[PDB]
Write a protein that binds this DNA or RNA. Structure first.
Ligand SMILES: O=c1cc(NCC2CN(C[C@@H]3Cc4ccnc(Cl)c4C3)C2)c2cc(F)ccc2o1
Ligand SMILES: [Cl-]
Ligand SMILES: [Mn+2]
Ligand SMILES: [Mn+2]
Ligand SMILES: [Mn+2]
Lengths: 671, 670
DNA sequence: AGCCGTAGGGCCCTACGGCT
DNA sequence: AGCCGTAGGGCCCTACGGC
């Protein structure tokens, strides 16, 4: 744990706080052991502005610091008892390191304010480009960050205690809405004042969580971790027709290439995209144990294999035709997509769920046939209304099936982006023999843990909080599908029992809609229409850019083809012209001038292999050339009449609906 | 946590024992929840043959089977209290599953012997091709293994209790040697009798660990994990000139392609190869917290990055030149090297350390100049004596420097493969002012944890087990290197204190030399000479094959160039021939016919780009031909004569020693 | 309540041989 | 005794918002 220095003269000593043991090892290896101590922490640290005291005092990482500092806390804070006069925060140089810093200041500020007032609290400034202090060699760390001769600490200054109380309460407090407002007002897409630092550090954290972690893009419906996963699967060509591949490779690969975060965030995001109880349309095809509806985790990543689903191909379809803008990855050594072509409205179809900072999102999945007809109808009428859409899109369609009670929250969510929706299991009452009945549950509400739900029921019977239940079993199986059996006592009204379980168990459960997604890179709450409007315009830009791309590429080809026909019509002079040229450059120049060729045409000829002279290519080329001219007119046509552009989108979407659309699962009963 | 079945009638109740919760998931998803209970365990389970009773009674996974079985054990075993009539062992279908099988039986036999007597014990037979049962889809597991209508269970049958007795004790007992005899005796390079299965399961496990895990190869000194790692580094071109790559993806890559084992075994083996205090010549070049001599682990693999060292390039040099035999990986989707060319004696240079089954290895690191001078001397005197070799190779050379006391143990290790080697820290006594002194240690023995040792010293001071010390400081730094200061009480005899310290602490330690390596695929205790003979033999083959390889490719290419030269000699004919051929196939036949070309020459011409017709290109074509002709002769000379070939290896080894040889670090004192 | 899902962070048991 | 290194297997805390 704590790696203390040897000098017991506090005023000369210093303790450094690092995010964990990985960072601690480099920090132990580079320090001057005489005067520098190290306490590795354990990641995110309790937000003592939110927690109550008993929990605070029983928190190990806190206790370690109090112990380590020796000054006591609060009323008993005794600054003279300090064992170091420099406490240095040295978190990783990332937003998460910045968050932790805010977490640490909050504590010092809430429980050790004089420590700040005496200027005992400093902030190391380690350099960027490292995932964590564990990535630095021990000599670079000491020099950049720990050598007093050159390190650049920032002593924490406390200017206006009134301004600081509000900051910690605003930034780190129970009340989300002031958090959210501070972000909205400040989001923009030697010594240090503790107010600016908290504001500046925490805003970078929040913003990063919002636009690059927890919320999905309206266009493709994806978060970066999923976008990176499927992209990585794409880039490695791991498609449905190819065999499965090991999850660990994938994770390490994506982690090295696109997603610089722990394997668990990567592995578990990939796991969910494969669970058919999680994804209305699974994007990942899984080989092996990928968890269960009882809350069983997936097998460890070394055991499992995965690959793209077929529908995933439509997300990536046309990605290499300049339909979307690529960007550089975290270290610059790679390009990654900012968004996928998403040839189907993935956001609504699979829905979404995220806890951000200052906000959350909660978007239910939907039936794909309805959505496309939804997008189809919108394609034909920009002023279409919400209720006219719910003729196509009757509502959410959970991968778990089950039932929905009434259309009242559906409509409010679609009109406002927020609304509440009751999900009911599918339960029938049936006879079990000898004058007794049983309740049989074959479908459960979305995101509900079956075992947990069974547990609670057992809990009520045992607690006599519910009367009339005799036995309780889970007969679920592969051969059966879900089958949960509740045996009722003879001559009891099974229906009153059922109505109790809905009220008293997750047997009935509510989905709270909170459709926030990223719109032009900014979080926005959207109603159903804006969600569809955005996907549509996305599809418009996609098909357009793709058409503009196929067109550049065809004109290039013909120009090369024009050049090659010439070469063929004068090959003997071509050859000798070449034979008598010392350098390519000489030849390049000579070809251009004699035959009015461009460089490409001229290059393409030089690269032409002898085998291309066979007697028949000249028409093969001629043949190819002519179709090319028909293709170009065809393309030029689409880019010159937006209505033509639109109908093609309709066609390709229609094509999608026929292939992948399916029946509704969730029954919507009028409440 | 047992997943019990809803029913409660032992007559029809089966409990499936599986390695863990990953395996337990698929099993639960495909089983019949009505009648099949599942108890996931936690990997290698306690060897009850080697454990102490109280310790056994307090083992968690043991207690769980009992509690689950509900029949007690040993004396108070009450078969009537059985809660299942089938205890089905469903370990993964790997050698480690087989080991775990042997460990379960051992417990059943020794403590629940009636179960077997009653025939209640069964062995599921999951199909091969899977890593564990978590890689299976539930339906596949149910159909092939759990469905009573298609499965092929084996019921366990005791047949001779004296035989079983002797066997269990032989296999699982703490007597290593009877286990070793059994292997060497039986090494090969429905129902089921319990003796047959144990014998067969255990032997299968031991074989695998002997030949494919724990022992290095005499030729390259590598264990399979190291080899596959370095090889993997090579295939991905993670070379010293290129930049570091994240450990995590290397691990994932090595694991997927070559090493189907836990990332911990992969990462830590990689880490060891990069620690300058573990490897005498680090094979890996690592970036970040790769641990310390204090037993600090490395940083997690999401944090670190790695690449080959330069010297690793010499382990891998010319692997493409058909120098070693490739093999199929574990699933036939890849090829991997059987050994590396090892253009330097890696076995002795970095030594090896490995607990196997029935045996272990402990080879110490050595100085490379010496090693290579050893080989060089050997190469001129097949009959050189071990003493003559020690004139090159004075003894091990630990990465940690330090002292070795005497040479009789060395001399014993090198002549027998075995011998004991007393190591000591480098400690001096110096004054600190005021007539006082201190003991300053600047080097510690090999593989000694430094912090532990200091903590050990502080205990004896506390426990008063030693007297005369007033302070004890680890003043180590990157600028200092190692420096541990023991402050001595004024007028004490600091030498006397130093002497007690050596007796009571790892300040002195011994290295037990146990030089066992894989020779022709089999484990062997070798002497130093043997080790070098095989190395040199390895180098001989490697360079011969490279040369034979280099010769075929040159000949191929010269052949091709001969065809381009002809095409150049008659380009106009060439053009006509092609221009009046309707297809490439027609053209190709015409070129062969018209120019007496082989098919391959004919294609090279067809593929020739127009740009090859310019004056510079044709020169390049002619020039490369002329060089090839000379290179070809050079090669043939070497195959014409063994001394020439033999002289080359010396040259290349000498080359290597000049590039990488360094000074001795460990001092051999008399 | 505590859970939902992307995030920060980390340690334990077992087998096996041989040396102290 | 318990350490040396390749191996089987697995789990906890924290932040974040909404209900
Ligand atoms: O970044 C990573 C991390 C990987 N890590 C292996 C997993 C981390 N290990 C699980 C926990 C660790 C730990 C600590 C303390 N206590 C407990 Cl219980 C545990 C269990 C296995 C990884 C593996 C790959 F194949 C490829 C890329 C990888 O990239
Ligand atoms: Cl070419
Ligand atoms: Mn970090
Ligand atoms: Mn309910
Ligand atoms: Mn296993």
């Amino acid at each position: 744990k704590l790696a203390d220095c040897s000098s017991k003269s506090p005023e000369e000593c210093e303790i450094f706080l690092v995010e964990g043991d990985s960072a601690g090892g480099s920090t132990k290896s580079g320090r001057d052991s005489r005067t520098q101590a190290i306490l590795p922490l354990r990641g995110k640290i309790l937000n003592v502005e939110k927690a109550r005291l008993d929990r605070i005092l029983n928190n190990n990482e806190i206790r370690q610091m109090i112990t380590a500092f020796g000054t006591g806390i609060g009323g008993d804070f005794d600054l003279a008892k300090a064992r170091y006069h420099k406490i240095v925060i040295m978190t990783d140089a990332d937003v998460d390191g910045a968050h932790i810093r805010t977490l640490l200041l909050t504590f010092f500020y809430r429980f050790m304010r004089p420590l700040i007032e005496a200027g005992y609290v400093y902030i190391a400034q380690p350099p960027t480009g490292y995932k964590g202090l564990g990535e630095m060699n021990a000599d670079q760390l000491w020099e950049t960050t720990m050598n007093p001769e050159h390190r650049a600490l920032l002593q924490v200054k406390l200017e206006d205690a009134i301004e600081a109380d509000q900051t910690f309460e605003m930034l780190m407090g129970d009340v989300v809405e002031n958090r959210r407002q501070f972000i909205e007002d400040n989001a923009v897409y030697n010594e240090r004042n503790i107010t600016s630092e908290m504001r500046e550090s925490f805003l970078d954290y929040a913003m990063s969580v919002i636009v690059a972690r927890a919320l999905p893009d309206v266009r493709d419906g994806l978060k970066p971790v999923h976008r990176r996963i499927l992209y990585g699967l794409n880039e490695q060509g791991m498609t449905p027709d190819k065999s499965y591949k090991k999850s660990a490779r994938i994770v390490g690969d994506v982690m090295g290439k696109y997603h610089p975060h722990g394997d668990s965030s990567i592995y578990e995001a990939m796991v969910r995209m494969a669970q058919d109880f999680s994804y209305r349309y699974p994007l990942v095809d899984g080989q092996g144990n990928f968890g269960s509806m009882d809350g069983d985790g997936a097998a460890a990543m070394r055991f499992t294999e995965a690959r793209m689903t077929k529908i995933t191909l439509e997300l990536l379809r046309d990605i290499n035709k300049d339909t979307i803008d690529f960007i550089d990855n975290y270290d610059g050594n790679e390009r990654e997509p900012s968004v996928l072509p998403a040839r189907f409205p993935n956001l609504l179809a699979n829905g979404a769920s995220g806890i951000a900072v200052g906000m959350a999102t909660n978007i239910p999945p939907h039936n794909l046939t309805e959505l496309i007809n939804g997008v189809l109808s919108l394609s034909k009428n920009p002023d279409i209304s919400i209720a006219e859409l719910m003729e196509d899109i009757e509502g959410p369609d959970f991968p778990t099936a089950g039932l929905i009670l009434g259309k009242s929250g559906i409509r409010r969510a679609y009109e406002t982006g927020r609304g509440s929706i009751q999900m009911r299991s599918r339960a029938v009452i049936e006879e079990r023999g000898g004058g007794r009945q049983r309740i049989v549950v074959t479908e459960i509400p979305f995101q509900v843990n079956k075992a947990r739900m069974i547990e609670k029921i057992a809990e009520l019977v045992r607690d006599k909080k519910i009367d009339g239940i005799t036995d309780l079993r889970d007969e679920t199986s592969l051969r059966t599908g879900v089958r949960v059996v509740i045996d009722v006592r003879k001559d009891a009204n099974a229906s009153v029992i059922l109505n109790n379980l809905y009220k008293q168990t997750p047997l009935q459960t509510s989905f709270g809609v909170n459709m926030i997604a990223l719109v032009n890179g900014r979080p926005k709450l959207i109603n159903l229409k804006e969600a569809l409007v955005h996907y549509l315009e996305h599809q418009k830009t996609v098909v357009r850019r793709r058409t503009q791309y196929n067109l550049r590429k065809a004109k290039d080809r013909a120009h090369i083809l024009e050049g090659l026909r010439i070469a063929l019509d004068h090959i003997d002079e071509i050859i000798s012209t070449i034979r008598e040229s010392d350098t390519d450059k000489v030849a390049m120049e000579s070809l251009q001038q004699r035959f009015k060729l461009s460089e490409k045409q001229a290059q393409a000829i030089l690269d032409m292999r002898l085998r291309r002279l066979t007697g028949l290519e000249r028409d093969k080329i001629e043949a190819e050339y002519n179709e090319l001219l028909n293709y170009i007119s065809e393309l030029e046509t689409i880019l010159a009449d937006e209505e033509v552009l639109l109908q093609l989108v309709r066609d390709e979407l229609t094509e999608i609906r026929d292939r992948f659309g399916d029946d509704r699962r969730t029954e919507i009963q009028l409440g």
